Amino acid sequence: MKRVQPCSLDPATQKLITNIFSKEMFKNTMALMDLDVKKMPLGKLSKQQIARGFEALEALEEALKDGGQSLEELSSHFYTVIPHNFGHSQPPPINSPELLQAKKDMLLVLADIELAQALQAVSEQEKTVEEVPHPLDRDYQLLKCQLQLLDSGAPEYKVIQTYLEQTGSNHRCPTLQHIWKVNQEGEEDRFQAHSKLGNRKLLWHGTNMAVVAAILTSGLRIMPHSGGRVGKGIYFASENSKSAGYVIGMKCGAHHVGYMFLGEVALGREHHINTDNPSLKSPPPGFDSVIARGHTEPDPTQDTELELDGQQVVVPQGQPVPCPEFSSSTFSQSEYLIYQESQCRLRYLLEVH
Numbered sequence: 001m002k003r004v005q006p007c008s009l010d011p012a013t014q015k016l017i018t019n020i021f022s023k024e025m026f027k028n029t030m031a032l033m034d035l036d037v038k039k040m041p042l043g044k045l046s047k048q049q050i051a052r053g054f055e056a057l058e059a060l061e062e063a064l065k066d067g068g069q070s071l072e073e074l075s076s077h078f079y080t081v082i083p084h085n086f087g088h089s090q091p092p093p094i095n096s097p098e099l100l101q102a103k104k105d106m107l108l109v110l111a112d113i114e115l116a117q118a119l120q121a122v123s124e125q126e127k128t129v130e131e132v133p134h135p136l137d138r139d140y141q142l143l144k145c146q147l148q149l150l151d152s153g154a155p156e157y158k159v160i161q162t163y164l165e166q167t168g169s170n171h172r173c174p175t176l177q178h179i180w181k182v183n184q185e186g187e188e189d190r191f192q193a194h195s196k197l198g199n200r201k202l203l204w205h206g207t208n209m210a211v212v213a214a215i216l217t218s219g220l221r222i223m224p225h226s227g228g229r230v231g232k233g234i235y236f237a238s239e240n241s242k243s244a245g246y247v248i249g250m251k252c253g254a255h256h257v258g259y260m261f262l263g264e265v266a267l268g269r270e271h272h273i274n275t276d277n278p279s280l281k282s283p284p285p286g287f288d289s290v291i292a293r294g295h296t297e298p299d300p301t302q303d304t305e306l307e308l309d310g311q312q313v314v315v316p317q318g319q320p321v322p323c324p325e326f327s328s329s330t331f332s333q334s335e336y337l338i339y340q341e342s343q344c345r346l347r348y349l350l351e352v353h
């Protein structure tokens with residue numbers, strides 16, 4: 001009988017680790033994506049199944065763009081590979097770009113749920129040691145990501161709170177509960193490659209609770225089937241309200257808990273666009289980033305800076321104001337795009353209610 005060592009984590013961090021590895025959380029997310037958890041339990045999810053789903057979506061995409069299989073037949077194959085639940089009615093045929101991308105996105109999220117399950121598999125060294133860490137220590141250790149909870153008077157704390165408050169929704173701004181500093185080392189080496197590149201900004205990235213463990217383990221990633229209104233890159237926002245739209249939170253007790261990242265992004269020379277371009281795979285030549293510019297932007301006259309690893313990083317502090325040059329943009333709020341994973345380092349994780 002092995003000893004369970006006492007937990008080293010503070011209460012807030014124990015809660016985070018409980019939440020981002022929660023089996024209920026993961027199954028709730030699968031239900032929210034219309035998956036049939038009975039047919040596709042967490043422990044049964046595999047990389048092969050996910051890869052087969054992407055092959056089925058690739059066939060669908062080719063059909064959508066002959067005498068090949070019907071969209072219904074090809075949809076049926078996808079739905080056999082990745083079981084869905086629509087209260088035991090037929091699932092719907094995947095017959096639009098929008099629905100195709102929504103299934104790609106679902107699988108990208110499912111891939112990160114499978115990553116978290118794979119991470120948790122018990123190693124052989126763990127079966128042999130006579131003492132084990134507390135389970136929340138074990139789970140924290142698996143991330144290979146240093147988290148340090150910040151208190152009120154950490155130098156950046158007020159700056160981050162201000163960014164959240166001034167750029168979050170005016171009527172029901174998310175309520176800040178915790179901030180952690182995030183150090184995923186060996187993001188370090190690849191990030192140091194952009195050390196010459198100025199124009200760094202701290203930007204919001206909101207996400208599903210179900211992908212937080214994966215992000216902490218592996219950083220923000222660009223995968224083969226990722227897409228959106230500015231193409232195949234990593235998406236950020238300068239307005240918390242925009243990123244908060246992507247936060248899938250979870251009911252815990254009387255409240256709704258969600259997580260948002262702050263990334264330091266080396267934007268370099270910006271290419272500004274004012275119309276959607278879902279086909280982009282890089283900036284144009286001589287540019288380091290693409291900014292889909294919104295009707296509004298956090299008032300640039302109120303920008304401050306933080307010093308992170310000896311570099312100045314801009315942090316907006318202003319309420320959003322109108323930008324006359326982009327009053328006719330297809331974007332209400334800006335989307336900031338990088339097309340190399342190396343141009344972002346995770347810096348902070350916020351718990352918001």
Ligand SMILES: C[C@H](NC(=O)CCc1nc2ccccc2c(=O)[nH]1)c1ccc(S(N)(=O)=O)cc1
Nearest residue numbers: 105108112205206207221223235236237243246
């Ligand atoms: C489908 C899901 N996408 C998101 O979570 C997008 C979240 C998001 N989109 C934004 C778009 C514009 C501006 C801001 C954001 C943002 O803050 N989050 C996703 C989840 C996981 C992955 S992975 N496993 O390839 O690293 C990729 C994509």
